[PDB]
Design a protein around this ligand. Structure first.
Ligand SMILES: C[C@H](CCC(=O)NCCC[N+](C)(C)C[C@H](O)CS(=O)(=O)O)[C@H]1CC[C@H]2[C@@H]3[C@H](O)C[C@@H]4C[C@H](O)CC[C@]4(C)[C@H]3C[C@H](O)[C@]12C
Ligand SMILES: Nc1ncnc2c1ncn2[C@@H]1O[C@H](COP(=O)(O)OP(=O)(O)O)[C@@H](O)[C@H]1O
Ligand SMILES: Nc1ncnc2c1ncn2[C@@H]1O[C@H](COP(=O)(O)OP(=O)(O)O)[C@@H](O)[C@H]1O
Ligand SMILES: [Mg+2]
Ligand SMILES: [Mg+2]
Ligand SMILES: [Zn+2]
Ligand SMILES: [Zn+2]
Ligand SMILES: [Zn+2]
Ligand SMILES: [Zn+2]
Ligand SMILES: [Zn+2]
Ligand SMILES: [Zn+2]
Lengths: 596, 186, 596
RNA sequence: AAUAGCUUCUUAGGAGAAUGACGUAGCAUGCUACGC
RNA sequence: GCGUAGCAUGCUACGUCAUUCUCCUAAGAAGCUA
């Protein structure tokens, strides 16, 4: 039962029991972790508690090695030795561990509760092994927090898909979205037994909800639904492969002139073949993934893998690939998951297709020539470790923008994370340079991008296709019927009534909203299917409909407004309280009854 | 051990002896206490040895019972396996033609080799070379053991298929010989 | 040989060979059973009997474990400790034995004799393992009771159907009954061969009996007949699977509309899909087997099994079933048995069609969607567990009405058995009802359903064709003119001497009477054949002249009265002391010395 | 993933024997208190 | 002269503890030869 010191890389036989993940610690390293932190549970090949029956001295500093068995001071054997001595702890390979001074940082990462930006900003800049450790422990911590909130029960039986739920009074309630599934335990007395998995949806009225279970079980009154557990495995592979350069191109073979409509990118198409890994910063609404498919053509027989973090994004990109490539292409995304559906095209498990499109959760462990992760602004150091671990290819290219919207980070409730610090790749994108630049946003109404220029960016983008028919009605934010903490401004949709029939040709728009439940309400009294900003960031649409919410901190993120408006092609409207932002958006706004 | 009657008597005997020595009486009580503790420790040795024997005896018996149970379990499982294989083997053989030829035999005794040689419905030729191929099972039908068969699949040594066209005098080297060619009675 | 304790379920190697069935008992549990009763022998993986030659002591309480075997107190080696100590008898897993104190009812089962009603009422009101063990035990007792009987030598063989068979010397003759199927034998001298199985019937007179045979290999005068038996097999499966309702048809693919005459039943057919298993009460004359075959048609894409107890019941089942079914059918029960001729339509071993009709005791290993079990007011605990053991379907329904009679069950001699305690399924059918009630009867006259619904039923079944000429001529019963132990109510027959002429259109009527001798002495001076309801429940008639007997509780059992009144089309007359019963049935009461 | 034979090593058990020490009983001898 | 008692010594038997030896069994790992 041996391993490597997570700080000194020597063989050690110890672990910290009180620390959440119990990592291997060299002898002196464990001494320092235990001297000044309240953590005092150290496990050797056997635990270190005093083996005297009824003796519970658990501080390692108060035990003694006896003959064959350790003990406490009172119950100590006749002869033995003190364990914690001379700045060391007696462990296997005691003499040949080196031990280092990374003690303060490790103590912090071990004791912290991650609730402040310190842990993120520090894990973004610490040592690689320590980085991975911090990532795994943060995952496990948030997982353990998932356990804090409570159970659901049934209150009254109405039908097969209309039930009244009852929250255990006095505990945090869970958000009613597809990303929550619970096992159904029924207590007879005498056979407390699971019935199956269940997911809910808040209907048009409470406390009635419409729901789906994996089984068609008959729901009684003695049933209830408890959250389903999740764990974390440890990862070893690097996050960012060490950079390398060359003077020739190997493993990839050029093309002569094919697909001239992908011209300007060839100059960068070569340097990618010259270097070991590189990145492309793509301003909002730019020619990103166009460059991707263009390089895919440039090197036709070079086996390629595409990956991203968002299922909507990987679906959009697999469709765009279906648009221009021989097919002869697979998107092995998800067989029996992804509550919001995706591809139904090709295999999920054959490991044969040249251009493999996949998602982090379902990545296989194969090889390829080049792999490209996408949308680095959302993924985290952990995700980076997974995507670098499961695969192995010759060249690596990441394409994203630091000015996109980052991961949720629920326990992050104090402070803010700058674009750089979303993860290590974003850090390198905010280092001395994104090392490869291409900026022009044409897929959007040129006027809105001209305003995006006037926003946080430095007025450096251009476009075509400006007109027309865009505005922003700053209707007052009505009563937020916030069932969940996510907003529902039905009175705001209370003006959509005057845009249900008044629009003769504006029918197949796509609706955007800040909060999840003010998207749900558009999915309640429906005129068209709507999607959230997280489902956005990767698709553009002809018209866009937008009803915002109160001036809450989450709403007034300008980057969110960017990743929202940048999903337009010819049409857009905005409904925001907007004490000031209307002076920032330059269009021709009107009032409620003035639609002619 | 401690629960034995001698234990308490011995302990209190030594105790009261030490008490009387702290009283410092005449040595006759010293002799008496010596005798008391002596007989106490004697019967104590007795019972201690008895318990020491009992431990080993019980443990031997228990491990023996474990061994017996293990043997019986394995025995029943193996008998079930044997019976299952026997019956599933039996329920395969082509009972009709077998009944025919045996009931034709004048005694119910027929040497074994002719049993497959005249009731098998398959034929797994194995060929080491294009030449013996040419001279045993050419084409799509052939004749052997006085009956007419027909090819149905020609699997090479790598467990792949080989279309009957590929096997040609100039296409000998690319085929990883031997050539397990099956057939069917007809 | 390691098993589970019948009370503690902890792994153990102990059996009471003093018990006929030898169940597995945990240490303490066998301790309690062995200290209290006359069960004075215990067997482990090796028997606990004194190994000393000539030492034939048996009980373990006088045994000490010595060297490698166990001895009586006499021949014990010096170091040898008792096998009984601390409530534990020496066996495997003594430190993991949990046990319990439910020894009481278990002991009741171990000590009872099955000759009193309370025994059975306990045996059907106990724990599950307790239930199945009681079943196996009572069945073995009745098996050895049958085997406690003997032989019968053929005096003369009159014909293939008429027989002169004298019974064993000094033996209580097994009565003339259908259930006891007699195996015959003709010794050559030199290899007595088994001549097959044959059933008997009280013929038109004594001594000559009517009989049927499985084979046409005719009997002789040197043959002798015993009846057949077996050895009782162990069981694992539960008596009944727990209840499961469902919100939709779990894979039941119905028909479109065909045979809309079953619309009165599709209302329940839906419920069949709605539940896992249930019951249905069809009183004689009702849409049973019509319900059933219409259900087969309504779900025509699901394999179905049908089952009953006797060959009579199973052919009465498969009839009217061959009608509405494309054939394309199977009812494949018996290869080399069936004393009376049986299924003569299809194969022996192919489990060919989706609908099979058999009997519980003869089912092979088959799978299907639903097993329909009629005749359930006859079945007992054993057959239910056999059913659960052999048929793992997706639905089940127990068809039948508890108002009929129970089994012979000859051992009951102190009291009688109530339907609510016949077995588990009838207990449910009485403690909660059938949960599914079928109405109504059609064949019988309404005057014998509405008048008879006043007794055990709750006035819910109906019928039609009330007329004609059904009146109860209550005769004051005479003295017990019994020749055999059963009464001969010739004084009751003293009302028919002046009747053979005054019934113009009633000549082919059926004299029926509960006592077999009440049929025999009547058959001596007879005008029409006799058939008591034991051979009935499967036979229909137009007229009937039911003759009661002595005023004992035997004659006035309302269940037998219902099953003897509901077996006619147009006519019935009742002749009894009848101080109260004729008040619950409403017709024109008549007196014997008056012909009106 | 065979039959058989030899040999080195390790552990547990049993049996036996030697040796030394402790304690109980009995046998022998001496010295002495007491009694006759 | 005898006995009770005590002490000391030698002898015998028994019952404990430790050391060694011997053999036999069982189980396991490795080698060589036909
Ligand atoms: C007797 C022995 C040394 C005696 C000594 O005097 N050492 C000197 C101490 C070293 N100094 C002087 C440098 C300080 C000590 C030192 C190392 C200890 C073992 C290992 O940990 C682990 C091993 C696995 C489990 O734990 C269970 C048992 C094991 C065998 C332990 C038992 C015991 O506890 C050992 C043998
Ligand atoms: N060289 C080009 N010529 C024409 N259109 C281009 C070119 N490069 C990119 N585009 C277009 O930009 C549009 C998509 O931009 P988008 O991918 O929406 O931006 P972003 O990817 O940064 O979020 C597509 O219509 C794509 O063809
Ligand atoms: N709806 C109906 N119309 C006419 N006859 C019916 C109807 N339902 C049932 N029956 C009749 O009842 C008769 C059979 O009843 P039976 O099956 O003898 O009773 P049970 O099955 O309860 O013992 C059949 O002639 C059958 O058609
Ligand atoms: Mg893109
Ligand atoms: Mg029926
Ligand atoms: Zn270290
Ligand atoms: Zn710690
Ligand atoms: Zn202690
Ligand atoms: Zn038990
Ligand atoms: Zn018993
Ligand atoms: Zn004995």
């Amino acid at each position: 039962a041996v391993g490597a010191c997570v700080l000194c890389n020597s063989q050690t036989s110890l672990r910290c029991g009180a620390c959440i993940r119990r990592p291997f610690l060299c002898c002196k390293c464990c001494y320092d972790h235990v001297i000044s932190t309240s953590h005092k549970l150290v496990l050797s090949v056997n635990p270190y508690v005093c083996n005297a029956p009824g003796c519970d001295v658990t501080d390692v500093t108060q035990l003694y090695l006896g003959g064959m068995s350790y003990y406490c001071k009172s119950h100590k054997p006749p002869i033995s030795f003190p364990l914690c001595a001379n700045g060391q702890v007696f462990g296997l390979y005691k003499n040949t561990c080196v031990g280092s001074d990374n003690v303060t940082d490790f103590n912090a990462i071990a004791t912290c509760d991650w609730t402040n930006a310190g842990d993120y900003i520090l894990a973004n800049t610490c040592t690689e092994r320590l980085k991975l450790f911090a990532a795994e422990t943060l995952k496990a911590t948030e997982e353990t927090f998932k356990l804090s909130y409570g159970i659901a029960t049934v209150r009254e039986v109405l039908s097969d898909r209309e039930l009244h739920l009852s929250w255990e009074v006095g505990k945090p309630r869970p958000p009613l979205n597809r990303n929550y599934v619970f096992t159904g335990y029924r207590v007879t007395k005498n056979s407390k037994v699971q019935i199956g998995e269940y997911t809910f949806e808040k209907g048009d009225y409470g406390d009635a909800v419409v729901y789906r279970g994996t089984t068609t079980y008959k729901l009684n009154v003695g049933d209830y639904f408890v959250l389903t557990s999740h764990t974390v495995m440890p990862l070893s592979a690097p996050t960012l492969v060490p950079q390398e350069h060359y003077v020739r191109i190997t493993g990839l073979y050029p093309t002569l002139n094919i697909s001239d409509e992908f011209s300007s990118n060839v100059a960068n198409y070569q340097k990618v073949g010259m270097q070991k890994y590189s990145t492309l910063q793509g301003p909002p609404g730019t020619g990103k993934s166009h460059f991707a498919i263009g390089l895919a053509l440039y090197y036709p027989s070079a086996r390629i893998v595409y990956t991203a973090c968002s299922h909507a994004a990987v679906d959009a990109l697999c469709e765009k690939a279906l648009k221009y490539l021989p097919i002869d292409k697979c998107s092995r995304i998800i067989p029996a998951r992804a509550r919001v559906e995706c591809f139904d095209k090709f295999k999920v498990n054959s490991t044969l297709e040249q251009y493999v499109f996949c998602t982090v959760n379902a990545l296989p462990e194969t090889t390829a020539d080049i792999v490209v992760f996408d949308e680095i602004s959302m993924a985290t150091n952990y995700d980076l470790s997974v995507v670098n671990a499961r695969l192995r290819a010759k060249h690596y290219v990441y394409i994203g923008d630091p000015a996109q919207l980052p991961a949720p980070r629920t326990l992050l409730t104090k402070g803010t994370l700058e674009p750089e610090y979303f993860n290590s790749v974003c850090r390198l994108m905010k280092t001395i340079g994104p090392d490869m630049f291409l900026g022009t946003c044409r897929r959007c109404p040129a006027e809105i991008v001209d305003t995006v220029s006037a926003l946080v960016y430095d007025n450096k983008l251009k476009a075509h296709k400006d007109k027309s028919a865009q505005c922003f009605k700053m209707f007052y934010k009505g009563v937020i019927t916030h069932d969940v903490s996510s907003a529902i401004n039905r009175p705001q949709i209370g003006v959509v009534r005057e845009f249900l029939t008044r629009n003769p040709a504006w029918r197949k728009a796509v609706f955007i909203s800040p909060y999840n439940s003010q998207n749900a309400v558009a999915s309640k009294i429906l005129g068209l299917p709507t999607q959230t900003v997280d489902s956005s960031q990767g698709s553009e649409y002809d018209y866009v409909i937008f009803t915002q919410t109160t001036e809450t901190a989450h709403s007034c993120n300008v980057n969110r407004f960017n990743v929202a408006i940048t999903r337009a092609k010819v049409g857009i409207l905005c409904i925001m309280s907007d004490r000031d932002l209307y002076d920032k958006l330059q269009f021709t706004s009107l009032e409620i009854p003035r639609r002619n | 051990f401690s629960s034995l009657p001698s234990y308490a008597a011995f302990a209190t005997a030594q105790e009261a002896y030490e008490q009387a020595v702290a009283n410092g009486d005449s040595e006759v009580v010293l002799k008496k206490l010596k005798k008391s503790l002596n007989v106490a420790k004697s019967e104590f040795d007795r019972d201690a040895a008895m318990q020491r024997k009992l431990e080993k005896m019980a443990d031997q018996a228990m491990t023996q019972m474990y061994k017996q149970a293990r043997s019986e379990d394995k025995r029943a499982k193996v008998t079930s396996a044997m019976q299952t294989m026997l019956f599933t083997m039996l329920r395969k053989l082509d009972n009709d033609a077998l009944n025919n030829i045996i009931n034709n035999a004048r005694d119910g005794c027929v040497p074994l080799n002719i049993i497959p040689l005249t009731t098998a419905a398959k034929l797994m030729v194995v060929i080491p070379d294009y030449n013996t191929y040419k001279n045993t099972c050419d084409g799509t039908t052939f004749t052997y053991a006085s009956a007419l068969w027909e090819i149905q699949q020609v699997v090479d040594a790598d467990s792949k298929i080989v279309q009957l066209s590929e096997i040609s005098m100039d296409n000998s080297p690319n085929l990883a010989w031997p050539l397990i060619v099956t057939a069917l009675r007809a």
